[PDB]
Amino acid sequence: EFKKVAKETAITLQSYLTYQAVRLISQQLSETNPGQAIWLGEFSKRHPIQESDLYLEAMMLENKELVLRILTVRENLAEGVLEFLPEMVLSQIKQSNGNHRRSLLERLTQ
Amino acid sequence: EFKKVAKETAITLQSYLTYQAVRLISQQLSETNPGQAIWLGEFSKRHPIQESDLYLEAMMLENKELVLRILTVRENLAEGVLEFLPEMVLSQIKQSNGNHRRSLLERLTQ
Fold first, then answer.
1. CA atoms within 13 Å, Cβ hemisphere of A12
2. Quick one: CATH architecture of A1-110?
3. Phi then psi for A50, rounded to 5 degrees?
4. Chain A residues lying within 8 Å of B7, measured CB to CB
C-alpha cells in the first residue's frame, strides 16, 4: 500500500503547503494591509482550508488577487522546501525512533 | 521564513507518516488480531495521534509491542514514500495552479 499512502501523503502535503502559503500571506497582510488580513481570517472560518482546491475555488468568487498570490506563494514554498523534506523527515524519524527504542529498552531492562 | 516552514512541515510529515503507520497496522489487525485493532481504536480516542511522540510515550505504558511495530512500520513507510514526495507534490501543485489559473483567466476574460 505504498502507493495508496504516497498518494494520500502528497495530497496532504499539497494542502498543508497551501495552508502555510495562507499563513505567510496573512502575516504580511497584518502589517501591509490589515483589512485584508481580517477578511482572509473570516473567509477561512467560512471555508475549510483543509479542502484546498474548494477553498481557492470559493475565494475566486470574492478575491481573485488573493487567490493568485496563494498560488504563487505556495508554488515557491513547495519549490523551496520540498528538497530538504526527505532528508529531514527521515532523519527526525530515525532519531524519534532512536529515543523511543532507547526509552523502552530501558524499561524492559528495568 | 523557509526555515520556520520547512521545520513545521517536517514535523507535520513525521506525525502524519506515524498516523499512516497506525492506520496500516490497524488494518492488518482487523483480520490478523481483531481484539488489538479495537484496543488500538479506543487508545486513539483517548490519545491524539496528532501529538505523536506523546501518543507513543503513552502507549509504552500499555503495549510496548505495538509501539515497536509503529516505529518500524513508520520508518519503512518514510523510507519507501519520501523519495517520490518532492516530484509528486510539486507536480500536483503545478497542475492545481494550472487549473486555477486557467479557470480564473476564463472568468477575467468572461
1. 17
2. Orthogonal Bundle (1.10)
3. -60, -45
4. 88
